[PDB]
């Protein structure tokens, strides 16, 4: 599934991401735009053998079990396949664990390079 901007915003607010640990809702919408263009079925194979899954491109080296990533960890206790669902519930929940580390949204390179320091309110204009 490919969410529209306001569709994704609504879903994220319902699943508790507006002002989760100081990150206003637009930080998350912006993150999803540049990570995956709002596409829950996005995947990208990294050179080490891991894969980024889902709308927030969560990585199999640490966070989920895809069965084919060497020396990996599954911190979110979920199979990576569940991060390809249209329903974002399990991605949000794993994203919350990630962001609750000291590193914050630095976990997502695309947020750091293109969202951090900008006006993120724009990403929820008119929804």
């Amino acid at each position, epitope marked *: 599934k490919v969410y529209s901007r306001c569709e994704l915003a609504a879903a994220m607010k*319902r699943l*508790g*991401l507006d*002002n*989760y640990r100081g990150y206003s809702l637009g930080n998350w919408v912006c993150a999803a735009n540049y990570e995956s263009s709002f596409n829950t079925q996005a995947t990208n194979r990294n050179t080490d053998g891991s894969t980024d899954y889902g709308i927030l491109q969560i990585n199999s080296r640490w966070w989920c079990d895809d069965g084919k990533t060497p020396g990996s*960890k*599954n*911190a979110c206790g979920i199979p990576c396949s569940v991060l390809l669902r249209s329903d974002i519930t399990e991605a949000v929940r794993c994203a*919350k664990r990630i962001v609750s580390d*000291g590193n914050g949204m630095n976990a997502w390179v695309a947020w750091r390079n293109r969202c951090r320091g900008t006006d993120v309110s724009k990403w929820i204009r008119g929804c």
Partner: antibody, heavy 113, light 108 residues
């Protein structure tokens, strides 16, 4: 399975440091975040803080720089150091993992002269 | 620090009946509200996470609903074993905080 157990003294004198240890079974230690919670008399729960494998901690402001949470990853253990205790830190102390799935047994620490 | 208000402070119930427990938040916490059970001389046990999401091993008769500021824990067909304290807890904002708690006692 994942199991936790608190250890360390049950009686501490005012102004000394309260030093507790939580020992963890299994392989989850380096992949999870780890917490300390305490229960005061009157069923009052206070979330003291947690540590990630990243080395980063978050501590309750109410503890005013008295609290340290540290990891020893080679031994699957973590620690709580709480400086300059008073009678007000008398409580039951729990270790637990961040999502709340697994908890230790609680250990009652008394602070008194 | 977000304040969580649990009403009422105490319930007494005859087994077989139902109860609803309330937790109110002093600001919007989305769905970031979790529910615990604590029996005497025991550790808290997680019952519901993220307002409505169920936990493996926890009887189906426990459910949760709500969002924003108002949350509800339901226990359908209360059993004698269910007696003890019930605490809500938010993970929206640091520091994490607990409600003052609701005591469930058995009526005889």
């Amino acid at each position: 399975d994942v199991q936790l157990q608190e250890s360390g003294p049950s009686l501490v004198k005012p102004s000394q440091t309260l030093s507790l240890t939580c020992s963890v079974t299994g392989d989850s230690f380096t992949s999870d975040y780890w917490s300390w919670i305490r229960k005061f008399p009157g069923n009052r729960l206070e979330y003291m803080g947690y540590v990630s494998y990243s080395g980063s901690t978050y501590y309750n402001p109410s503890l005013k720089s008295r609290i340290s949470i540290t990891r020893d990853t080679s031994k699957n253990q973590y620690y709580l150091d709480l400086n300059s205790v008073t009678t007000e830190d008398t409580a039951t102390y729990y270790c637990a993992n961040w999502d709340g799935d697994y908890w230790g047994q609680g250990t009652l620490v008394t602070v008194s002269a | 620090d977000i304040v969580l208000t649990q009403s009422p402070a105490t319930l007494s119930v005859t087994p077989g009946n139902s109860v609803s427990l309330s937790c109110r938040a002093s600001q919007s916490i989305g769905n970031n509200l979790h529910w615990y059970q604590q029996k005497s001389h025991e550790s808290p046990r997680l019952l519901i996470k993220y307002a409505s999401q169920s936990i493996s091993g926890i009887p189906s008769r426990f459910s949760g609903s709500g969002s924003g500021t108002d949350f509800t824990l339901s226990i359908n067909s209360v059993e004698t074993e269910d007696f003890g304290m019930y605490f809500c807890q938010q993970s929206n904002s640091w520091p994490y905080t607990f409600g003052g708690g609701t005591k469930l006692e058995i009526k005889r």
